[PDB]
mmCIF file of C-alpha atoms and ligand atoms in Angstrom:
data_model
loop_
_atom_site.group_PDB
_atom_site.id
_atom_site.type_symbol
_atom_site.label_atom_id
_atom_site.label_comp_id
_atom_site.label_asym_id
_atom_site.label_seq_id
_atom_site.Cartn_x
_atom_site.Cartn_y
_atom_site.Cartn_z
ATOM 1 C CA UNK A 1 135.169 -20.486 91.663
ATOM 2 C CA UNK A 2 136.475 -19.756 95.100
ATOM 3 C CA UNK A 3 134.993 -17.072 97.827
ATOM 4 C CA UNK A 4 131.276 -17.013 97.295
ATOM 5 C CA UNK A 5 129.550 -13.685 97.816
ATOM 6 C CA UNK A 6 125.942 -12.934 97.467
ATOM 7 C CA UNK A 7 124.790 -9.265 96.927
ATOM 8 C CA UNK A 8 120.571 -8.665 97.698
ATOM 9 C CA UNK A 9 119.227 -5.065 97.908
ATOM 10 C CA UNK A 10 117.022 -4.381 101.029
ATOM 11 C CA UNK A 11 114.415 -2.295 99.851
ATOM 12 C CA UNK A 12 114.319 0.850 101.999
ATOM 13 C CA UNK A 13 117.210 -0.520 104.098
ATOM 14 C CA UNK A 14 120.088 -1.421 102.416
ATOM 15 C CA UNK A 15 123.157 -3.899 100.848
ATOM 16 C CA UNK A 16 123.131 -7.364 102.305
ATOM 17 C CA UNK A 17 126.075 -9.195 101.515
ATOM 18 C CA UNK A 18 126.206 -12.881 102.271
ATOM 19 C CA UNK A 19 129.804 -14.213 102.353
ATOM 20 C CA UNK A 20 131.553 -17.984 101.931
ATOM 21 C CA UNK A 21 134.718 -18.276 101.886
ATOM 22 C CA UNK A 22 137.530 -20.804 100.878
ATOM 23 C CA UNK A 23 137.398 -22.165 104.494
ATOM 24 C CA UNK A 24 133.470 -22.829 104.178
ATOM 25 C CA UNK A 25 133.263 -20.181 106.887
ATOM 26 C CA UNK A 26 129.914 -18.472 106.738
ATOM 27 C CA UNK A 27 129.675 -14.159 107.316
ATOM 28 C CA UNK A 28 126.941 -11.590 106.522
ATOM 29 C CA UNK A 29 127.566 -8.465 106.360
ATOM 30 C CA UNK A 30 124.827 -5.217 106.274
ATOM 31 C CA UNK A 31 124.936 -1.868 104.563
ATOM 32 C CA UNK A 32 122.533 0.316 105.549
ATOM 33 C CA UNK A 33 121.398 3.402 103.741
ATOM 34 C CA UNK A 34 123.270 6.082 106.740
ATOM 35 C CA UNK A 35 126.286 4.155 106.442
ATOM 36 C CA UNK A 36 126.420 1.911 109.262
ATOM 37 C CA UNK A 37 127.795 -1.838 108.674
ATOM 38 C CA UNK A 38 126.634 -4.958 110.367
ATOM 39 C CA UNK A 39 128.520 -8.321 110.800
ATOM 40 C CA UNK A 40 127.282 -11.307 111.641
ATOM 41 C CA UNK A 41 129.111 -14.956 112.272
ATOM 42 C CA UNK A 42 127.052 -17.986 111.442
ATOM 43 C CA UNK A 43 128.337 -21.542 112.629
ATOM 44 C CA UNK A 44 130.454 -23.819 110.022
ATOM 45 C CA UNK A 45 127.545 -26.594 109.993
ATOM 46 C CA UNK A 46 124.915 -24.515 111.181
ATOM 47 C CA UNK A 47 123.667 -21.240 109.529
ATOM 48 C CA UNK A 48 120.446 -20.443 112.113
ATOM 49 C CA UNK A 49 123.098 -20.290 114.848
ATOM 50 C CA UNK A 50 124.651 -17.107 115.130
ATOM 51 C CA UNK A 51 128.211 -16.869 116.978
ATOM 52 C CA UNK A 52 128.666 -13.316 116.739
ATOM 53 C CA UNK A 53 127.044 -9.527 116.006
ATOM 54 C CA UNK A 54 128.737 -6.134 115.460
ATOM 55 C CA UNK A 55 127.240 -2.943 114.781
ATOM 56 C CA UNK A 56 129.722 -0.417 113.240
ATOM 57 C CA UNK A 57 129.325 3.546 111.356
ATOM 58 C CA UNK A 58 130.978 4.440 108.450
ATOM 59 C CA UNK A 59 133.917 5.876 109.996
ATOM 60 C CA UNK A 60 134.361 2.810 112.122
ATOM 61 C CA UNK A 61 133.956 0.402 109.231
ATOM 62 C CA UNK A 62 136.730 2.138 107.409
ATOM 63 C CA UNK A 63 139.503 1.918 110.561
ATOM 64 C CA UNK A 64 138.994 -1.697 110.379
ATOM 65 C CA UNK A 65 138.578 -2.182 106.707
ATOM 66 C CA UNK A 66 142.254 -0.529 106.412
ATOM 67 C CA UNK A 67 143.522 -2.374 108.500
ATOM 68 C CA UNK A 68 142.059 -6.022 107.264
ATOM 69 C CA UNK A 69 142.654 -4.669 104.049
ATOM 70 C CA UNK A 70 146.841 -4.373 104.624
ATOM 71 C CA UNK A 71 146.701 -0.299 104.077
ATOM 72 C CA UNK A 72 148.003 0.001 107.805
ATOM 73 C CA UNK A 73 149.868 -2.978 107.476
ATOM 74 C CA UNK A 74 151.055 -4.269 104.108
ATOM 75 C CA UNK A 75 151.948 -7.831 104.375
ATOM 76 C CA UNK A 76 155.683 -8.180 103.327
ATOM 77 C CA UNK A 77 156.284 -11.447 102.173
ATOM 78 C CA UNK A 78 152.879 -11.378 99.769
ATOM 79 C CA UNK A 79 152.700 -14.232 96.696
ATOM 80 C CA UNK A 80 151.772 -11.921 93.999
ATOM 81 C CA UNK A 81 153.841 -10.404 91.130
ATOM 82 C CA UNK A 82 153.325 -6.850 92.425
ATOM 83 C CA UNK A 83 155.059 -7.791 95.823
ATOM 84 C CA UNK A 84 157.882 -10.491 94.626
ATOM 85 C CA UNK A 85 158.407 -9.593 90.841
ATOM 86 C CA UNK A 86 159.050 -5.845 90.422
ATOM 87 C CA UNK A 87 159.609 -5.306 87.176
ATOM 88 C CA UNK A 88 157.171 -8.568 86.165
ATOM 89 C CA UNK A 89 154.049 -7.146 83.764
ATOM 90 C CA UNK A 90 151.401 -9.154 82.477
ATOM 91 C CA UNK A 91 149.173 -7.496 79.991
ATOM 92 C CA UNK A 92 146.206 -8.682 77.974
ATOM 93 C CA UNK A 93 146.500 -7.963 74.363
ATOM 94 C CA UNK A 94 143.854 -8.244 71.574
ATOM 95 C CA UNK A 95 145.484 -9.354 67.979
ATOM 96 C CA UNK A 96 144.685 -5.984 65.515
ATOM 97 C CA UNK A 97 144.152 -6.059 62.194
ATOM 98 C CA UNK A 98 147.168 -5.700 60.362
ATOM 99 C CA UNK A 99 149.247 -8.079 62.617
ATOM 100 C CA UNK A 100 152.133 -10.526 61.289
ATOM 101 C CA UNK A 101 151.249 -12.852 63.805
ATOM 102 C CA UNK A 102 148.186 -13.945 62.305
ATOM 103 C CA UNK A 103 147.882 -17.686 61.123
ATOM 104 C CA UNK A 104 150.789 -18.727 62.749
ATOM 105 C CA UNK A 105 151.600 -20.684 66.027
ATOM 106 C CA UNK A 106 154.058 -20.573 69.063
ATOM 107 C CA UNK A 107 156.326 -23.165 67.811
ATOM 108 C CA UNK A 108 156.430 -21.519 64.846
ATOM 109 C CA UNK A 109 157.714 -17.930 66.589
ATOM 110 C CA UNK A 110 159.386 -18.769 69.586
ATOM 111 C CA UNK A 111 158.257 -16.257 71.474
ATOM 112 C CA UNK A 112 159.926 -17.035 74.724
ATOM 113 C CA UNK A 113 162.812 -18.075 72.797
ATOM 114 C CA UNK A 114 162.660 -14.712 70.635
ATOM 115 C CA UNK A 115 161.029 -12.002 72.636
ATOM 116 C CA UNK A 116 161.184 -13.380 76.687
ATOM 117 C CA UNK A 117 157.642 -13.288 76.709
ATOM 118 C CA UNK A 118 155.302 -16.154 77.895
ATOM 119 C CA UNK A 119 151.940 -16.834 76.677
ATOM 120 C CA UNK A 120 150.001 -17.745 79.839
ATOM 121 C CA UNK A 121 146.438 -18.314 78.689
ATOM 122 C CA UNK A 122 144.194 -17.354 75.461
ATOM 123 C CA UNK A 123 140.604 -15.763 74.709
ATOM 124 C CA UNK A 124 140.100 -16.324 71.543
ATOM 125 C CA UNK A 125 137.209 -15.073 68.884
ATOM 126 C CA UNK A 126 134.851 -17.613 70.131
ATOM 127 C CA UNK A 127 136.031 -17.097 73.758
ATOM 128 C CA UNK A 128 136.778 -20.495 74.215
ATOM 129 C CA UNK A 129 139.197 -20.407 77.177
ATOM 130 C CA UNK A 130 142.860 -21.355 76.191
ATOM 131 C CA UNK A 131 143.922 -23.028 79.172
ATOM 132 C CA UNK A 132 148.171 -22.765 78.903
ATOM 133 C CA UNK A 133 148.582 -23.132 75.224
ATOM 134 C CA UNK A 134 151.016 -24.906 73.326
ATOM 135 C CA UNK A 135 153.512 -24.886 70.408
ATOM 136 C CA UNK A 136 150.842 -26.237 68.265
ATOM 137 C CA UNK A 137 147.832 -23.299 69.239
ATOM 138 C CA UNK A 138 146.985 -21.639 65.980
ATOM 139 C CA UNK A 139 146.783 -17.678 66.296
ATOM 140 C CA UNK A 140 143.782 -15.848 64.645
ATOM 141 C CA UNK A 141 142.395 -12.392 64.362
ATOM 142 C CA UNK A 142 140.458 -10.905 67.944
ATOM 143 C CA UNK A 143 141.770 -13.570 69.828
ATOM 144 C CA UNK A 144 143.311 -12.062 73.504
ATOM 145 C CA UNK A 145 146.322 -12.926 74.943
ATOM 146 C CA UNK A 146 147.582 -12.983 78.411
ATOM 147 C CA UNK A 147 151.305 -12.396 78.249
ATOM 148 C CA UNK A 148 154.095 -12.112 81.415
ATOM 149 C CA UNK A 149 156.985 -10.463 80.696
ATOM 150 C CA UNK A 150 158.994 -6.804 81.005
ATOM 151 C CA UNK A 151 157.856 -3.809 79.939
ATOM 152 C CA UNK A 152 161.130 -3.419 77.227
ATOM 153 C CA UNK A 153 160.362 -7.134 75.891
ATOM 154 C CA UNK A 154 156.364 -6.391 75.635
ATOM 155 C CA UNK A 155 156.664 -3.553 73.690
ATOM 156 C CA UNK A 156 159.055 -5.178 70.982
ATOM 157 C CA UNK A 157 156.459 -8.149 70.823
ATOM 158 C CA UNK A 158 153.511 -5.722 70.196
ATOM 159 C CA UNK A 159 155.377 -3.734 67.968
ATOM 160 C CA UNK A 160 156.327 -6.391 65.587
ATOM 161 C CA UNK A 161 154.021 -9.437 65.618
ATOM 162 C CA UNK A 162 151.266 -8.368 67.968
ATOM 163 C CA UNK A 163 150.264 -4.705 66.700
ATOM 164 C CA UNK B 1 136.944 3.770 118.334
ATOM 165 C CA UNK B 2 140.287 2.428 120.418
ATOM 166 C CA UNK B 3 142.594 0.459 118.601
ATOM 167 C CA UNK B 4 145.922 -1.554 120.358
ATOM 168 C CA UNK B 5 149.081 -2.364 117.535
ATOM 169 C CA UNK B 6 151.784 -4.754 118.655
ATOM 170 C CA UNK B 7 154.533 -5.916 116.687
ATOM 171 C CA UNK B 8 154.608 -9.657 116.252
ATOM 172 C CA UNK B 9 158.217 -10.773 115.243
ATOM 173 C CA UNK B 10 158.427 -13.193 112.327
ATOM 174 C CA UNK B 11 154.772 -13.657 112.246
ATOM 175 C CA UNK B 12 153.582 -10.111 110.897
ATOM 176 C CA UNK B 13 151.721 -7.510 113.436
ATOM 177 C CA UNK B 14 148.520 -7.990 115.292
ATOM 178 C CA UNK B 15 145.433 -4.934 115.901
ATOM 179 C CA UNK B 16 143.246 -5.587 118.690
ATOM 180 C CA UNK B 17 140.205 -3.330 118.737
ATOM 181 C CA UNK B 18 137.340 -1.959 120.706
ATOM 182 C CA UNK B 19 134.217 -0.665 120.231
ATOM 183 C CA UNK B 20 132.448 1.993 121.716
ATOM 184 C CA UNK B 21 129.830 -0.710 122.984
ATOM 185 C CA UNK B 22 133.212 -2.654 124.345
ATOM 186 C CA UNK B 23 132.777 -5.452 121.730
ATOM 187 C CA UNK B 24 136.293 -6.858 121.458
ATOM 188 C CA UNK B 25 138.107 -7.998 118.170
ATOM 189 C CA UNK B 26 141.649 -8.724 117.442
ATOM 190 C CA UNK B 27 142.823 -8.901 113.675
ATOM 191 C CA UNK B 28 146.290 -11.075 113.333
ATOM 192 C CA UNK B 29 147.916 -10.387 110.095
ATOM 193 C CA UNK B 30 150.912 -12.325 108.368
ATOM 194 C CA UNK B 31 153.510 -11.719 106.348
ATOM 195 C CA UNK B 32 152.296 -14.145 103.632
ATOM 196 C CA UNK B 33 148.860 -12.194 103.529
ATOM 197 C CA UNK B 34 146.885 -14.164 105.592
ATOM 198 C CA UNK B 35 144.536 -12.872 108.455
ATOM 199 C CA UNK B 36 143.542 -13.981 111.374
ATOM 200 C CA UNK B 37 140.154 -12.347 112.735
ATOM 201 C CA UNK B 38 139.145 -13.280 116.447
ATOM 202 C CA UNK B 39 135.372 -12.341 118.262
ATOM 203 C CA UNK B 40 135.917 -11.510 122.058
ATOM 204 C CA UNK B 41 133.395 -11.166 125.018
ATOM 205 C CA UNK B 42 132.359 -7.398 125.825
ATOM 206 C CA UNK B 43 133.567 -8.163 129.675
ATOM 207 C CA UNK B 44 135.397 -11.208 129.159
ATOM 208 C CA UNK B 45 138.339 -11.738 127.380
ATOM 209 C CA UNK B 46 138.931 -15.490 127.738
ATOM 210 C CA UNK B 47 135.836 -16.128 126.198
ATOM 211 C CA UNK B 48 136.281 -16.385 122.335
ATOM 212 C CA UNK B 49 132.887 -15.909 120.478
ATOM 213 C CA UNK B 50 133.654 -16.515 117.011
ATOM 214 C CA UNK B 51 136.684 -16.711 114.970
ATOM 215 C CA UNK B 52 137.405 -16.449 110.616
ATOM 216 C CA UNK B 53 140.515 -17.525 108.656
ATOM 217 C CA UNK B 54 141.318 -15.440 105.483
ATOM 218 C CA UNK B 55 143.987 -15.060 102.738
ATOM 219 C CA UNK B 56 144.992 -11.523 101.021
ATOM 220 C CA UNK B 57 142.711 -11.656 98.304
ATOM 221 C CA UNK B 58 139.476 -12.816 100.548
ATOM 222 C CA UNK B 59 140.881 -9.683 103.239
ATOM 223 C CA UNK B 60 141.284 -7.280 101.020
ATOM 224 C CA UNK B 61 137.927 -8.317 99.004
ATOM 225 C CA UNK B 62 136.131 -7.956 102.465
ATOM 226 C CA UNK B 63 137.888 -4.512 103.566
ATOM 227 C CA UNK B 64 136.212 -3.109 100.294
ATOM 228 C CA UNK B 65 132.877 -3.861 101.711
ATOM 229 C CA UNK B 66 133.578 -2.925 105.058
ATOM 230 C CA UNK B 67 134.975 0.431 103.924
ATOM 231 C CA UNK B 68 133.196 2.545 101.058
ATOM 232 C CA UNK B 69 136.355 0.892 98.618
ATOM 233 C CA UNK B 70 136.385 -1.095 95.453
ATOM 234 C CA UNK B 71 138.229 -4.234 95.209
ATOM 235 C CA UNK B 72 141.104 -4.244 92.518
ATOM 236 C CA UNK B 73 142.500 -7.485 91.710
ATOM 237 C CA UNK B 74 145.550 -8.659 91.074
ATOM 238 C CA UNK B 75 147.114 -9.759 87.921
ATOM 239 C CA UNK B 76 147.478 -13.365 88.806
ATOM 240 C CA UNK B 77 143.957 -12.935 90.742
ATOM 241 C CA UNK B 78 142.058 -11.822 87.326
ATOM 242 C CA UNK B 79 143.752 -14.425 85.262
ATOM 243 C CA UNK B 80 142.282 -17.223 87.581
ATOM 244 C CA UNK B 81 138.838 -15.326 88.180
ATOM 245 C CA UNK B 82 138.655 -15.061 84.080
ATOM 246 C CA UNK B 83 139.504 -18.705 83.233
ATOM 247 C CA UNK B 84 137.522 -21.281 85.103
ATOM 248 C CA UNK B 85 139.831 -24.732 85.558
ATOM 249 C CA UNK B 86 142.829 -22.239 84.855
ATOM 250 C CA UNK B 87 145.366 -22.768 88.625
ATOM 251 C CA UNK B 88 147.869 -20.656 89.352
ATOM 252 C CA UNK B 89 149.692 -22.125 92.273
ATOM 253 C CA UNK B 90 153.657 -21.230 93.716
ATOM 254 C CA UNK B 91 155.650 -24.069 94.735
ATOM 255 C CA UNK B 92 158.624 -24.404 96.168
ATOM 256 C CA UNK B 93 160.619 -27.837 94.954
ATOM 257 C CA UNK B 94 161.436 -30.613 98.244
ATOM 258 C CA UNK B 95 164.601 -32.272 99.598
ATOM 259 C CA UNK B 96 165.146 -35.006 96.559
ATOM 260 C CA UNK B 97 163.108 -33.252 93.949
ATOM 261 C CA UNK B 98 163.756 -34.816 90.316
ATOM 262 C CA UNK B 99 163.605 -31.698 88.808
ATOM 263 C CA UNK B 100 166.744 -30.506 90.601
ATOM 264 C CA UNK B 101 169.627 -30.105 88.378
ATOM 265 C CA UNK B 102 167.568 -30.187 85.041
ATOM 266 C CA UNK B 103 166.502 -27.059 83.474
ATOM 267 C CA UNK B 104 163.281 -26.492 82.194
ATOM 268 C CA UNK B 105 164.012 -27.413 78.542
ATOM 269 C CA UNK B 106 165.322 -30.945 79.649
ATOM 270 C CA UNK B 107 162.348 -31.922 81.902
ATOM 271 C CA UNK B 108 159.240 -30.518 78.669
ATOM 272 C CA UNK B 109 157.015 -29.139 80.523
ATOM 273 C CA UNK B 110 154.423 -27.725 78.666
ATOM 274 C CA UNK B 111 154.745 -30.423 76.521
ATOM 275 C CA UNK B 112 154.576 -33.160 78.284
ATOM 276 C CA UNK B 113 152.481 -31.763 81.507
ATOM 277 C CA UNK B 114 150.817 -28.958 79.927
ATOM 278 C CA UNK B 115 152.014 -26.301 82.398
ATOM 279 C CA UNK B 116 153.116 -23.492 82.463
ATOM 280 C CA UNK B 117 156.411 -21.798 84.190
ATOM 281 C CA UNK B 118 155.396 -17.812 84.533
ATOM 282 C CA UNK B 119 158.240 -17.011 86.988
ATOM 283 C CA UNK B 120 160.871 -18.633 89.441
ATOM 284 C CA UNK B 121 162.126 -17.046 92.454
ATOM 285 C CA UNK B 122 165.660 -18.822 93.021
ATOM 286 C CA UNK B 123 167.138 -19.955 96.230
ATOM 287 C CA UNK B 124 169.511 -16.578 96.352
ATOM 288 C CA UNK B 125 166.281 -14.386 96.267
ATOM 289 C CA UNK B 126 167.029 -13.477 92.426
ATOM 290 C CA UNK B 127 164.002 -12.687 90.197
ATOM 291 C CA UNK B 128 163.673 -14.887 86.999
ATOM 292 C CA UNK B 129 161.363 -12.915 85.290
ATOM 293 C CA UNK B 130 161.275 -15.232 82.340
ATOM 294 C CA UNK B 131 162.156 -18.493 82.893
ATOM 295 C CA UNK B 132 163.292 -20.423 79.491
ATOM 296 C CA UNK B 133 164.174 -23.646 78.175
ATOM 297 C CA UNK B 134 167.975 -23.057 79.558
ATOM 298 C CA UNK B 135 166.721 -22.011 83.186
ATOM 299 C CA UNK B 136 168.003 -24.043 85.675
ATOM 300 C CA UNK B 137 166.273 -25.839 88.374
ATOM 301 C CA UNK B 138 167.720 -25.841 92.213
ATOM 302 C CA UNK B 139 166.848 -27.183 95.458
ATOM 303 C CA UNK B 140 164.260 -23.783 97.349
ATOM 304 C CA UNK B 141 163.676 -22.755 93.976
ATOM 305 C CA UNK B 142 159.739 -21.318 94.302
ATOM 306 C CA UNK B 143 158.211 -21.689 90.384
ATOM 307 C CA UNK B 144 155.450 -20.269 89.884
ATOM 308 C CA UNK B 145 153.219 -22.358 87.758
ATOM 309 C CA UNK B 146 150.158 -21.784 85.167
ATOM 310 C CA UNK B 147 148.228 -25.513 84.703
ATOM 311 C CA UNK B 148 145.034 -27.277 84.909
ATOM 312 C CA UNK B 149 144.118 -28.969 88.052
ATOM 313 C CA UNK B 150 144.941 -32.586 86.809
ATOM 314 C CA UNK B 151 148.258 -31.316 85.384
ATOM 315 C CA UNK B 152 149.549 -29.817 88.208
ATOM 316 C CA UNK B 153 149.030 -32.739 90.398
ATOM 317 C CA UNK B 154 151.118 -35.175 88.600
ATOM 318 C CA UNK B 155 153.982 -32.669 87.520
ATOM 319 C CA UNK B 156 154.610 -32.208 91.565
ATOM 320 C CA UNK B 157 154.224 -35.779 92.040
ATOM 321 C CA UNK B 158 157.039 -36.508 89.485
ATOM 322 C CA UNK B 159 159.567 -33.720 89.955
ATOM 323 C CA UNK B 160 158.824 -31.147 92.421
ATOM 324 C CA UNK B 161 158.376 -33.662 95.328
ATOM 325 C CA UNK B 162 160.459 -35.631 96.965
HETATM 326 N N1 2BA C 1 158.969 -21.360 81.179
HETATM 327 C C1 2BA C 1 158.510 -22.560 80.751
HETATM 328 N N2 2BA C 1 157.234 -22.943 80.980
HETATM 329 C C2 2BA C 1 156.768 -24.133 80.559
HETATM 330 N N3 2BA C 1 157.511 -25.029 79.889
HETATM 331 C C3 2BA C 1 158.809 -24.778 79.590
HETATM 332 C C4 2BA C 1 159.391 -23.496 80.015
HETATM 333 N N4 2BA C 1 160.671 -23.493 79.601
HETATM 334 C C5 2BA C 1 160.892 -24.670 78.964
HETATM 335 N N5 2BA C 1 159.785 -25.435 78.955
HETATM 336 C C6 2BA C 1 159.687 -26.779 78.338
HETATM 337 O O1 2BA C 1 160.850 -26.961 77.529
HETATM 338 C C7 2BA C 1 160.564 -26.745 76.145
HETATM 339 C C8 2BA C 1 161.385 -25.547 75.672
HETATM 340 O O2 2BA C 1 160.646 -24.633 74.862
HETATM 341 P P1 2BA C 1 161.335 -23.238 74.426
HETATM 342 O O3 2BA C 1 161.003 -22.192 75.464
HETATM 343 O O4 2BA C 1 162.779 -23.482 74.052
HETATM 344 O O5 2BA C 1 160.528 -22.890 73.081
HETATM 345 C C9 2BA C 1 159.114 -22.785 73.159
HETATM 346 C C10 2BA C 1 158.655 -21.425 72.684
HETATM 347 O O6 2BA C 1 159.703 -20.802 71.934
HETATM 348 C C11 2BA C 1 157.455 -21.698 71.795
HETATM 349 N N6 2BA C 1 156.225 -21.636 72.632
HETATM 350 C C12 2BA C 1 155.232 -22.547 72.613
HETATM 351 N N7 2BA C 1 154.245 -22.238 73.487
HETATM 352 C C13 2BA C 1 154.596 -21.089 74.086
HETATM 353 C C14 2BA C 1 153.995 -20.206 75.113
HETATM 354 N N8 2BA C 1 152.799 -20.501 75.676
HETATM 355 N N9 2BA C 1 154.678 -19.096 75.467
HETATM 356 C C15 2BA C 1 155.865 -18.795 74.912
HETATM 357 N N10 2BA C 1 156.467 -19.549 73.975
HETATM 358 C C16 2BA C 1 155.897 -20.691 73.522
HETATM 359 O O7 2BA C 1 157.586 -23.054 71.366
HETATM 360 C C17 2BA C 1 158.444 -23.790 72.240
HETATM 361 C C18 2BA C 1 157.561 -24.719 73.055
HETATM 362 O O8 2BA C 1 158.184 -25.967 73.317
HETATM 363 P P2 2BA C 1 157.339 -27.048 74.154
HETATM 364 O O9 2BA C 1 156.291 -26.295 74.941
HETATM 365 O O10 2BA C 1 156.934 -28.195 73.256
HETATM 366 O O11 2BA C 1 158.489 -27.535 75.162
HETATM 367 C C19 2BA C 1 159.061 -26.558 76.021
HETATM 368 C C20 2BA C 1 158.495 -26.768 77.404
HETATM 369 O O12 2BA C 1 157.825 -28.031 77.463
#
């Protein structure tokens, strides 16, 4: 997956937390025990050379974490569902016991044809990951579903087939 | 700990800070989430130490270490943290895109590309919450779509391209 961050426990000192991200851009940062945060900036091809050092407090760390953290600024224009869709919801809902969904498929409901509500991906018993499924995925007991759709047109779903 | 806020129009708003030990930083922040972090010399400003690129989720997932937070994800963030090869990507269709003019029932999608359509912001900025076999597909229209890696690739290279 993407943004790698490693987490080690300084004995006696404190958090180290050793960051790549998507841009293969190396960062460490240090939590020590009275609160104060340390950031350093490696090279892109070279982790012994360090570009940069910052020493910060608590207090400090917080001002800036705010602010990189869009709580002073919320970026408008943001590609989530939470920012563009409104009144979008996905939730992820486990197939109960006595359900009338069980044993049948997606072709055979037409869900998004019947209830406006999309099947995005599938954990099922095993927790073999359902990458998009079809018309033709089979749906048992326990399996989990992630499903888009508004909170009127979830509710009917999980009232009837679902729950 | 001083800290400068300027407005930048049509970009988003930039934060340059200092220190109490005068080291320099200046965070740029877009519209579209992503941030812009810049490392400046304690006397001089021309020099540029070191610099980072970041989106919203890697920001946001770095503020909660920097602060004393904890890092919530979003719903389309969790779905692609929880299943491995599973993309989520936003696209917006090009100049002579295939797809335009054919809804989504005509083209088969997740039939025939094994993808996904969660939601499609059209050209007039109206929300298609669910988008069905009878939604249409325009020129600017930004579909937001659920595939594998492979399948992705090749359902932009024979639609939403162009
Ligand atoms: N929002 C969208 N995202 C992706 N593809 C879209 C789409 N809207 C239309 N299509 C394409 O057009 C066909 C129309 O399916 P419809 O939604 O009428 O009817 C659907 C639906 O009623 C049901 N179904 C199957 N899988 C589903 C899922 N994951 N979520 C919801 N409903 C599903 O079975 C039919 C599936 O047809 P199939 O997938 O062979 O073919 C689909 C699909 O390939």
């Amino acid at each position: 997956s993407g943004l790698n961050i490693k987490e080690n426990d300084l004995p006696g000192i404190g958090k180290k937390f050793e960051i790549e991200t998507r841009s293969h851009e190396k960062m460490t940062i240090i939590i020590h025990d009275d609160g104060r945060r340390e950031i350093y900036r490696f090279n892109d091809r070279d982790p012994d050379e360090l570009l940069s050092n910052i020493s910060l407090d608590d207090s400090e760390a917080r001002q800036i974490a705010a602010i990189l953290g869009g709580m002073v600024y919320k970026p408008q224009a943001l590609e989530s569902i939470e920012m563009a869709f409104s009144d979008l919801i996905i939730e992820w809902f486990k197939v109960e016991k006595g359900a009338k969904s069980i044993g049948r498929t997606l072709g055979e409901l037409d869900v998004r044809q019947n209830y406006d509500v999309t099947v995005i991906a599938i954990i099922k018993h095993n927790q073999e990951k359902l990458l998009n499924p079809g018309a033709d995925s089979i749906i048992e007991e326990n399996d989990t579903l992630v499903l888009s759709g508004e909170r009127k047109h979830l509710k009917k779903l999980i009232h009837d087939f679902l729950s």
